Design a binder for this molecule. Structure first.
Ligand code: GLC
Ligand code: GLC
Lengths: 453, 456
């Protein structure tokens, strides 16, 4: 049972708690070929049949590149203190390496100015998956040179925006950019090769480290973070095999990123099984990867239930999907189970020395539209109540949970799922570009408005 | 293999050549304005190419081309078949023309002229500018129009000197091998993408023919196809219907539109709903008349019916080899499949003059004694040229023959491991060594053109 009474729920949060809404550049911007933007690997992935539902693409999206003032006005009306957004590398350095696109920088310059004027805090993500297509020539993330391209891109953005940005994250979800994109073939560039994935793994960890150094060198005032979909790993049974399975799944899906960044090492059992196939790790890599961060971002939606897979010749971590425990599912099919969020954060703060935590993404897919000038999305409202409940519990128990960004300000391009899957607090009619604040959004606004106190 | 007796089986004006492709030999992948091709991306992402081999070095031809031309001249080979790198000419696919790129081929073509070497250029031999992948590569119709402009750009500069041009080399590879089987760049395995690539390459061929004739009307225009010699596993009804389905899919998909102005009926029945839009004028554009056509032949395609539930058209599976002779890449040697193939094609379609634009064999032996003993290559050539001479005697319009690899080179997904050259290349020293097969081929080709002399 949720609870949902906002006035009560609001009492459970400290006065300086940060409430936000989140978007990503490719998902909402459109204007793919204007002001010097060159193609990203997602433009390619969309336009090649077989990868994205309906062959949907980012050409128009929410037209946010043009309508951004309205959107910031909306965040202002909702009384949301913070906006988490991503910056398009294809706009800043269209070829990945090469000339800087001054018009690219100009746009986010204005965007940040726009937020500053409205008293909206800025949480920027440098990389939320739109890698300049040209970088695939050298091998993309499988090439170490791509990390150096990112390095220069980060130093460029932070030099321009560092005097106003409230916070910066290097990467959004290495798990997706790494395994889902290079091992499972589901996200761009759509590869299914362990050697390629391991290369991407290390080079993205490396690029993060280069990114930290770059930010601090040109904008040392801005708190630097990293955003991770750490998976709440839950065994199917308490059998010895399933417990061991959950630990391996943890090392592979979480440790591959958390241990290098926060412990300056890769997980030992993972190295045993997969080490021989990694690219060169240079003497100074791990110490660069493991620089101290001022904050970190957690993205969470649903647990990762695993069982052992004893199949002959199963690759590490040799696990398979266990069935859902809750009956409740979102429209995209993900199990709804709030307490996995609690145990996830506990495990992480026991296992790693972590800085302040912001819940950088939390939300649900529910595809109801506009009937009677209102969007009736009670199951989404329920979701936020139930999960914010857990976040308040974490605050009570002493964890340094400093903020929460509701995932998806508005409906947008949902990657492989195209425009089919809505995650927004605000409905978008893609034929008129009209924004309609959903009922869940009215609720979240009623909660967020009372902060700061 | 007596080369004198074999030489006599050919007409005096028969054309002997050696063949090459831009990405396989050139190197200099980042020089003079060249942007990446889909094959640079393909090579450099682990899992696609043996050893992760790439085209960066290759045979360093971009730097050593005059020496390689002198080599062709010294061999006595009259013709040179090569491809032009689109990534050097219009590096983003669309976008600004790169003059440095054009100059290189301009100077190459001048070098062929000065040496008396006839030029048979291939506009597209698989090196698509990576940027075009932004719109969906060959799955986007726009890519055909980019080619069209590329085609026109090249022929405007080179058309006053080129002896001949082919639009595309092997639609089958660029279409099915690249978009359905995932073996070649860009490495897709999707029928919808492959069908889009199929029509868009056919269409691009047509645009190319018109573009070339618009700016260089005198230049003979062709298309190079690895037409598959489809042989059934048995004469069973199921196997023979399968061979015909296979012919339609692997050959008909390209031969029918180009030479009959229609797609194969049964194939349209199984797959047409998943094809891209065929605009009103498309098929007439595709089926413009050609002055010649190139056949690439290596080995037969033996097939059997596959009754597996839901097996997609053409619903066939590989059948086993009849000969037990195989090249080092694993391809059956079976020369008579060349004869039956050519005769099938000429009965089935109305075709212009034929050149064998590729024929050769993978054998990986290297330099020992300062010499390369590649008898199986030589044996392969003598036997296949015999077949070509049989086709001549039977009255088939066989005008010329190009040996498959002037030199060992980057062999696509196989990297540098699989050698096809008449000339051995040591990739550390870049030293060219003429193999024994090369000596033999030079001996044969040197007698042509036979020239005006008496008889008795
Ligand atoms: O549904 C997935 C949503 O959460 C993901 O973790 C991504 O960070 C976000 O872009 C996406 O839309
Ligand atoms: O092995 C295949 C060889 O034949 C194919 O016909 C190609 O056109 C050539 O580039 C390749 O090297």
């Amino acid at each position: 049972y949720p609870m949902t009474d906002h006035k009560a729920l609001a009492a459970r949060f400290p006065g300086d708690f940060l409430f936000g809404v989140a978007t990503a550049s490719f998902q909402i911007e459109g204007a793919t070929k204007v002001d010097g933007r060159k193609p990203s690997i997602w433009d390619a992935f969309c336009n090649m049949p077989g990868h994205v539902f309906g062959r949907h693409n980012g050409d128009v999206a929410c037209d946010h590149y043009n309508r951004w003032e309205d959107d910031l006005d909306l965040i202002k009306e909702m009384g949301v203190e913070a906006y988490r957004f991503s910056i398009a590398w294809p706009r800043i350095i269209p070829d990945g390496f090469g000339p800087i696109n001054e018009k690219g920088l100009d746009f986010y310059d204005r965007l940040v100015d726009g937020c500053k004027a409205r008293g909206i805090k800025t949480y920027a993500t440098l990389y939320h998956w739109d890698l300049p297509l040209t970088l695939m020539g050298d091998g993309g993330w499988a090439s170490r040179s791509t990390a150096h391209a990112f390095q220069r891109y980060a130093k460029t953005v932070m030099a321009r925006l560092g005097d106003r940005l409230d916070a910066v994250a290097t990467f959004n979800e290495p798990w997706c950019a790494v395994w889902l994109s290079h091992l499972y073939g589901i996200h761009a560039p759509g590869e299914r090769n362990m050697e390629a994935a391991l290369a991407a793994m290390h080079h993205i960890n490396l690029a993060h480290g280069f990114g930290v150094e770059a930010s601090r060198h040109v904008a040392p005032k801005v708190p630097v973070g990293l955003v991770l979909n750490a998976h709440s790993v839950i065994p199917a049974s308490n059998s010895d095999a399933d417990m061991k399975a959950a630990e391996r799944a943890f090392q592979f899906h979480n440790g591959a990123f958390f241990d290098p960044v926060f412990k300056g090492e890769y997980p030992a059992e993972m190295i045993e099984a997969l080490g021989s196939r990694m690219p060169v790790v240079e003497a100074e890599d791990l110490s660069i990867i493991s620089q101290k961060l001022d904050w970190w971002g957690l993205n969470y939606y649903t647990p990762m239930r695993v069982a052992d897979d004893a199949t002959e010749g199963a690759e590490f971590p040799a696990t398979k999907q266990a069935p859902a425990v809750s009956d409740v599912k979102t429209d995209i099919g993900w199990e709804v189970y709030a307490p996995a969020l609690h145990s996830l954060v506990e495990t992480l703060y026991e296992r790693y020395e972590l800085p302040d935590c912001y819940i950088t993404e939390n939300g649900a897919c529910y595809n109801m539209g506009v009937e009677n000038g209102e969007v009736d999305d009670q199951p989404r409202l329920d979701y936020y109540a139930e999960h914010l409940g857990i976040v308040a519990d974490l605050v009570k128990d002493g964890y340094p949970m400093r903020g929460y960004f509701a995932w998806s300000l508005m409906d947008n391009f949902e990657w492989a799922e195209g425009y089919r899957m809505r995650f927004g607090l605000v409905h978008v009619d893609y034929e008129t570009q009209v924004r309609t604040l959903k009922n869940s959004g009215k609720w979240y606004s009623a909660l967020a408005s009372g902060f700061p106190k």
